[PDB]
Design an enzyme around this catalytic site. Structure first.
Site, PDB file in Angstrom:
ATOM      1  N   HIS A 229      39.906  52.676  72.166  1.00 11.24           N
ATOM      2  CA  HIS A 229      40.072  53.014  70.756  1.00 11.24           C
ATOM      3  C   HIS A 229      41.132  54.120  70.693  1.00 11.24           C
ATOM      4  CE1 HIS A 229      38.800  54.019  66.568  1.00 11.24           C
ATOM      5  NE2 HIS A 229      39.231  55.210  66.942  1.00 11.24           N
ATOM      6  N   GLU A 230      41.039  55.084  71.603  1.00  9.83           N
ATOM      7  CA  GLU A 230      42.021  56.161  71.651  1.00  9.83           C
ATOM      8  C   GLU A 230      43.377  55.609  72.103  1.00  9.83           C
ATOM      9  OE1 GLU A 230      41.399  58.837  70.204  1.00  9.83           O
ATOM     10  OE2 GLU A 230      39.303  58.188  70.050  1.00  9.83           O
ATOM     11  N   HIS A 233      45.516  54.362  69.508  1.00  8.28           N
ATOM     12  CA  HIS A 233      46.228  55.393  68.780  1.00  8.28           C
ATOM     13  C   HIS A 233      47.484  55.738  69.554  1.00  8.28           C
ATOM     14  CE1 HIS A 233      43.472  56.012  65.601  1.00  8.28           C
ATOM     15  NE2 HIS A 233      42.518  56.576  66.320  1.00  8.28           N
ATOM     16  N   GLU A 267      43.936  54.774  60.900  1.00  9.48           N
ATOM     17  CA  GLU A 267      42.612  54.885  61.502  1.00  9.48           C
ATOM     18  C   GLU A 267      41.797  53.613  61.275  1.00  9.48           C
ATOM     19  OE1 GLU A 267      40.913  57.143  63.492  1.00  9.48           O
ATOM     20  OE2 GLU A 267      39.479  55.466  63.422  1.00  9.48           O
ATOM     21  N   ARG A 369      29.699  49.909  66.366  1.00  6.30           N
ATOM     22  CA  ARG A 369      29.259  50.107  64.989  1.00  6.30           C
ATOM     23  C   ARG A 369      29.893  49.037  64.118  1.00  6.30           C
ATOM     24  NH1 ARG A 369      32.357  55.857  64.525  1.00  6.30           N
ATOM     25  NH2 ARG A 369      31.575  55.878  62.360  1.00  6.30           N
TER      26      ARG A 369
HETATM   27 ZN   LIG Z   1      40.341  56.572  65.678  1.00  6.48          ZN
END
Ligand SMILES: [Zn+2]
Ligand SMILES: COc1cccc2c1C(=O)c1c(O)c3c(c(O)c1C2=O)C[C@@](O)(C(=O)CO)C[C@@H]3O[C@H]1C[C@H](N)[C@H](O)[C@H](C)O1
Length: 1287
Positions: A229-230, A233, A267, A369
């Site tokens: 997830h990072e 980015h 995001e 999630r």
């Molecule tokens: Zn994030």
């Protein structure tokens, strides 16, 4: 492929793969950090991230850095070489897990090869400058104890350990002079603060986590996904597309609104799933355009770059080839670089929608999630990621050998406890809102539990801007989707161009912006006397130092007394729960109260079909008192009235822009350009509708659906508190007993918990279905229409604009200024039907939508019901209903239309409902009671047709009218073309089942037919193929209009409309639903009443009636007299004949005035003999299987049965009822049913057969047969005098 390196913390520095780096934020000062090159261009620094933090911030304090994270602190993490090495070996294991699959390898390959451009906005187009903090980082080459010698290197990613909050992973980019190269096409060295042991915990809402509130609940995250997830980015930052734009900001004006940082689109794209839909298509394109413009500057630089002053070693060509391939730029025979639209498109979508947390999770079969907007629980510590028995590179925690693959068992907190440890709360910190009352008394609520409501400002108003339409202009749609399959199989995404060597000149310009962080109060005190969801949930808890409690229905006492807990369940449940018994009865009581809990919770499946509502959870209001004080009054009722809106804590102010005007550009003498324009303005019109819908969806998801989420969690918590309170009470009562008694008490606490938890899961499922239903309801009725309104106004404005355009150029169009004049009308005629699936592909959201559209009751666009002596539309579409003075209304939903001019109802339909489906598709249903014709006025009755309900707009629409014994449905299209269908009942019947009697009507319309149904059965059909467009959203007028007699009136009930054709099945069902009642009915169809004179009718002997025989206490059966006058149009049998009976109530002596007769009631069947009141009796001792009833004065005789139980054996709708004689109420001994028996009579003079009023056992078995025999002689109906029937 990708190569992960290997090393141990203690390995020697070689200035190549293990170095002493000087981090960007160090600004060329301070010590260096031992860094390890885990892969090309990627470094790992196994130490705490301290840049911008104060040493004390590492300790847990009464502060917090982020208002939405349960923050964990531990300043000892990574404080020894061994801890560091463990960090290293873990990072290595994670990277290996990441590359274990194509998708992961590619993400890594993209990152490694996505080297930052050499320079930023400040660098001249012709130069390459490596001397900036976003391109070069230094390494200390000299020996220890001096920074004498240093070399510069290029780098893509530097990963540190965690900052103050261990579970607060973050990817950071480099800012220089207020600007970010990673946000303007260049890309720049990315940094990260990561912690692999302490991962997040999430709990799926619509799902169970091991299905049990008593065990740990939820799932822990696979650190590999958290890292990817990072990395996503990082990827964005490296390609310089981590741009900023209009963010989603939360409304913080109210105390119940969740406060938090602004959420950028970047995001939500990274998370994927539904989150991208919260970013309007408008803003999706804003970003798109910003990124494209960044790529244009970079591509222009490649055509102008000539040198690199900073480093004479840089090979200009090699880099030009690397960037050309990085950005997928198209070169040309001469070396001219330019942008390829197709390739750019694919790259952009791959980066924003391909690599997402959601897609990667699905691919690695890892659970996460459901949404970015989800409550955050306490994090957990993974015991040992380096133990292959708990976590593997191939499968993570979901190891199939341990049978932990299915349903993500390895991540289930209640199942894989050997894999993680709970965290010491005395090290956690959360932002709380201390809600105080003006006195003092305060309750703490974690910011996380509040409602997140996106503020109006979060949405783009780009729709209000004008647009120039040219033969050029084309439509633009951005797909927030991307086929992960082709992405994984893609053959050119991953570069095959040489990666330049990382060595270069030392960085000397250390200029860089370094963020400064600082904690803020962990508690914010506010003031409010409001007792909403938070207070109500609180009233349901109790201190840990209290063990003896009692439930109470009183919210206020529950707050006042610590030993009192609030319960929204039934009064009976609360008394039983508080009941104290003998040890010998404890077991019984336990089963009893536990069984009650389940029944109470099970009420969540309550239906309310008569109100056209299939599912309602009656207790939600009492449980949370959320929204418009839903704890007061009856929720169900308040819900039938205002619907879903009453559950919202806040009604969002929607942004619905006035779609900008279209400035059309004309081309004189051009037949092609001029046309092309019009066509484009047409297609652009569609882009406007779709874009408006996406604007709505985004607001629904972030301002409304979020509130309903908070409510779903609230119920899960409420139901949970109830179970725990009952758990507490039970534990307390059991422990009051002695050990001697406990031994003989039979209780299984695991069975009690199993049953309580089951009842809850069953309720949670209902509540979820219910709540999602409401949410979709609010979308479709409270949001879509407000948008349709504007879009329709835009259409009109565009219509003239386009005609007036085809007008001014009528010349340059010659013989075609017409062929298109229509093209414009026929096109702006068909509108785009909303389809949630166009703006999202989230399975849950789609199912909610389809489930909604499959429920026929949601097709109701008008439903007139009675409320507080008035008629109101409860369809939810807000039709204005004007009820004039001449209309009579009763609380039985009956309304009367008379001959007076003021006897009418005006209904202004909602103009914003997709009604014009382009072929005519809607239904109309209603009950009606049409009075009998006057015998002396038969001619006018059969000749004069009169309208009763008229709906017209521009001489088109529909009409319901009546002509004597015929009701007619009439359609009139725009062309004035007419088609009719009608139902006429016979008026020559001895006994009609229609004249002056309530009956159900249903008219349906589809492209081919107009059908009329009566009482659920199809009666008439009419082919309506020719009929063209029919405008049915015009004003509806209920009023008798035509040449009617002054006495002419009409009763109607349950008038409703559906924007679709009902099936024979839907209709039969509505008939049964609206026919249902606890009370019996009379001949006309009205509620049977006590103390009301009635003549008796027998469905098994239509033309027969009862008369007290002159010389004996019996009722003989005579033939009804008939219509005597000479008309050829009419014939009937008198109904106002025979004895006049009156039903008396048997129980509670509350006098003899009136009241409704309910099934199974015990009564007396009396009647009037002159001035006296007599009764119907049965001689107790008859041996035959039937005898004549005994009619005589009211008296008490032990020899006669005088009590009757009124029954209803027919399961289908009917106005007949049966009369049963029983020994006595309690006794199950049936004497028989009242009916009619034929007897043979042979006297000295007369010989004949005669029928008498009788009681008989024979019917006892007959009434059980199926289908029900409507002809049985025991079926009766009561006829009272009625203005609607004169003879
Ligand atoms: Zn994030
Ligand atoms: C093999 O049939 C039987 C054998 C043993 C007992 C029985 C019967 C029987 O057929 C029967 C009945 O059919 C009826 C009755 C009945 O008691 C029996 C038996 O006990 C009761 C009834 O007369 C009533 O007064 C209802 O209020 C209705 C009904 O009579 C039918 C036929 C009658 N002659 C008369 O025509 C009546 C109007 O309908």
């Amino acid at each position: 492929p990708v190569t992960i390196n290997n090393f141990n913390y203690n390995d020697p520095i070689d200035n190549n793969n293990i170095i002493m780096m000087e981090p960007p934020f160090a600004r060329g000062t301070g010590r260096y950090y031992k860094a390890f090159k885990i892969t090309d261009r990627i470094w790992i620094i196994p130490e705490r991230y301290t840049f911008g933090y104060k040493p004390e911030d590492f300790n847990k304090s009464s502060g917090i850095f982020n208002r939405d994270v349960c923050e964990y602190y531990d300043p000892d993490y990574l404080n020894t070489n061994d801890k560091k090495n463990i960090f290293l070996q873990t990072m290595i294991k994670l990277f290996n897990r990441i590359k274990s699959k194509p998708l992961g390898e590619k993400l890594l390959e993209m990152i490694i090869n996505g080297i930052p451009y050499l320079g930023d906005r400040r660098v001249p187009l012709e130069e390459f400058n490596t001397n900036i903090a976003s391109v070069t980082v230094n390494k200390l080459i000299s020996n220890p104890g001096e920074v004498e010698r240093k070399k510069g290197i290029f780098a893509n990613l530097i990963i540190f350990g965690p900052g103050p909050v261990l579970n607060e992973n973050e990817t950071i980019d480099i800012g220089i002079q207020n600007h970010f190269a990673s946000r303007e096409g260049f890309g720049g060295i990315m940094q990260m603060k990561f912690c692999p042991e302490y991962v997040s915990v999430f709990n799926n809402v619509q799902e169970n986590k091991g299905a049990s509130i008593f065990n740990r609940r939820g799932y822990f995250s696979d650190p590999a996904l958290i890292l990817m997830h990072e990395l996503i980015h990082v990827l964005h930052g490296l390609y310089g597309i981590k741009v900023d734009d209009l963010p989603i900001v939360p409304n913080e004006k109210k105390f119940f609104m969740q406060s938090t940082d602004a959420i950028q689109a970047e995001e939500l794209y990274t998370f994927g799933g539904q989150d991208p839909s919260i970013i309007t298509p408008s803003t999706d394109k804003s970003i798109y355009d910003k990124v494209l413009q960044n790529f244009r500057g970079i591509v222009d630089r490649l055509n102008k770059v000539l040198v690199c002053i900073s480093d004479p070693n840089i090979n200009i060509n090699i880099y030009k080839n690397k960037f050309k391939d990085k950005y997928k730029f198209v070169e040309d025979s001469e070396g001219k670089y330019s942008i390829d639209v197709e390739s750019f498109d694919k790259l952009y979508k791959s980066l924003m929608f391909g690599f997402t947390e959601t897609n990667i999770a699905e691919n690695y079969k890892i659970k996460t999630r459901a949404s970015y907007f989800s409550d955050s629980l306490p994090p957990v510590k993974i015991k040992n990621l380096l133990d292959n028995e708990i976590y593997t590179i191939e499968e993570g925690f979901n190891i199939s050998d341990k049978d932990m693959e299915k349903e993500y068992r390895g991540q289930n907190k209640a199942i894989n406890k050997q894999a993680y440890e709970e965290i010491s709360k005395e090290h956690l910190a959360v932002y709380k809102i201390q809600m105080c009352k003006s006195v003092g008394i305060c309750i703490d609520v974690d910011n996380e539990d509040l409602f997140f409501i996106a503020d109006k400002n979060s949405f783009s108003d780009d729709l209000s801007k004008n647009e120039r339409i040219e033969y050029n202009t084309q439509s633009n749609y951005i797909e927030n989707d991307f086929p992960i399959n082709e992405l994984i199989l893609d053959t050119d995404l991953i570069s095959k161009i040489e990666l330049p060597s990382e060595n270069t000149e030392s960085l000397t310009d250390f200029n860089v912006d370094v963020p400064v962080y600082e904690k803020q109060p962990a508690i914010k005190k506010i003031f409010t006397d409001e007792n909403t969801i938070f207070q109500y949930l609180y009233s349901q808890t109790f201190p840990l130092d209290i063990r003896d409690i009692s439930l109470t229905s009183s919210f206020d006492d529950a707050l006042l007394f610590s030993n009192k807990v609030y319960s929204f369940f039934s009064m009976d449940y609360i008394k039983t729960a508080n009941k104290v018994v003998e040890a010998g009865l404890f077991a019984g009581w336990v089963k009893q109260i536990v069984n009650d809990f389940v029944i109470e919770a099970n009420k969540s499946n309550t239906m309310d079909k008569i109100a056209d509502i299939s599912l309602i959870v009656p207790y939600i209001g009492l449980a949370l008192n959320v929204g418009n004080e839903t704890a007061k009054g009856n929720f169900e009722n308040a819900f039938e009235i205002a619907g879903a809106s009453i559950l919202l804590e806040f009604i969002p102010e929607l942004l619905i822009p006035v779609v900008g005007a279209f400035l059309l550009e004309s081309y004189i003498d051009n037949k092609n350009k001029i046309i092309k324009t019009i066509d484009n303005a047409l297609t652009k019109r569609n882009e406007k509708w779709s874009d408006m819908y996406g604007l709505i969806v985004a607001q629904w998801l972030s301002t409304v659906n979020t509130q309903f989420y908070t409510i779903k969690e609230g119920m899960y918590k409420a139901l949970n508190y109830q179970a725990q309170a009952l758990e507490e009470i039970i534990k307390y009562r059991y422990n009051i007993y002695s050990e001697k008694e406990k031994s003989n008490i039979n209780i299984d606490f695991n069975d009690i918990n199993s049953k309580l938890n089951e009842g809850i899961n069953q309720a949670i499922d209902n509540i979820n279905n219910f709540i999602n239903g409401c949410s979709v309801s609010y979308l479709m009725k409270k949001m879509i229409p407000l948008a349709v309104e504007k879009l329709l106004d835009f259409d009109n404005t565009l219509k003239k604009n386009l005609l007036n355009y085809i007008d001014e150029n009528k010349l340059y169009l010659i013989g075609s200024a017409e062929y298109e004049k229509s093209k414009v009308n026929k096109y702006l005629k068909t509108i785009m039907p909303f389809d949630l699936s166009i703006y999202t592909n989230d399975t849950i959201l789609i199912e909610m939508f389809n489930k909604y559209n499959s429920e026929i009751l949601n097709n109701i666009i008008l439903n007139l019901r009675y409320k507080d002596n008035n008629l109101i539309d409860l369809s939810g579409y807000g039709a204005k209903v004007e009820v004039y003075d001449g209309v009579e209304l009763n609380d039985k939903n009956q309304f009367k239309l008379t001959s007076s001019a003021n006897s009418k109802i005006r209904v202004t339909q909602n103009q914003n409902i997709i009604f014009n489906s382009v072929f005519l598709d809607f239904s109309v249903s209603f009950w009606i009671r049409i009075p009998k014709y006057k015998n002396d006025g038969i001619q006018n009755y059969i000749h004069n047709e009169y309208t009763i309900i008229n709906c017209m707009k521009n001489n088109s629409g529909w009409k319901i009218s009546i002509r004597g014994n015929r009701i007619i449905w009439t359609l009139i299209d725009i062309n004035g073309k007419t088609k009719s269908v009608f139902f006429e009942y016979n008026i020559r019947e001895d006994i009609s089942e229609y004249i002056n009697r309530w009956f159900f009507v249903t008219i349906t319309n589809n492209l081919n037919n107009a059908k009329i149904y009566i009482n659920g059965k199809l009666e008439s059909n009419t082919d309506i193929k020719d009929i063209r467009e029919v405008i049915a959203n015009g004003e509806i007028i209920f009023k008798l209009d035509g040449d009617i007699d002054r006495t002419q009136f009409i009763w109607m009930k349950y008038f409703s409309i559906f924007n679709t054709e009902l099936s024979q099945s839907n209709i039969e069902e509505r008939y049964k639903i609206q026919s249902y009642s606890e009370y019996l009915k009379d001949f006309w169809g009205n509620p049977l009443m006590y103390n009301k004179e009635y003549y008796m009718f027998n469905a098994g002997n239509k033309n027969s009636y009862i008369k007290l025989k002159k010389d004996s206490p019996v009722g003989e059966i005579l033939t009804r007299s008939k219509y005597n006058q000479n008309s050829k149009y009419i014939n009937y049998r008198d109904l106002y004949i025979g004895e006049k009976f009156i039903i008396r109530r048997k129980s509670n002596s509350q006098s003899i005035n009136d009241d409704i007769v309910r099934k199974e009631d015990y009564i007396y069947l009396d009647f009037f003999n002159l001035n006296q009141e007599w009764r119907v009796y049965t001689y107790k001792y008859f041996k035959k299987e039937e005898e004549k009833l005994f009619l005589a004065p009211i008296s008490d005789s032990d020899e006669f049965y005088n009590t009757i139980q009124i029954k209803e054996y027919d399961e289908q709708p009917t106005y007949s009822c049966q009369l049963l004689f029983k020994k006595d109420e309690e006794s199950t001994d049936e004497i028989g049913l009242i009916g009619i028996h034929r007897f043979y009579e042979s006297g000295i003079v007369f010989e004949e057969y005669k029928d008498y009023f009788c009681i008989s056992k024979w019917y006892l078995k007959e009434v059980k047969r199926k289908p029900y025999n409507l002809k049985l002689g025991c079926n009766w109906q009561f006829i009272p005098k009625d203005e609607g029937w004169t003879e």
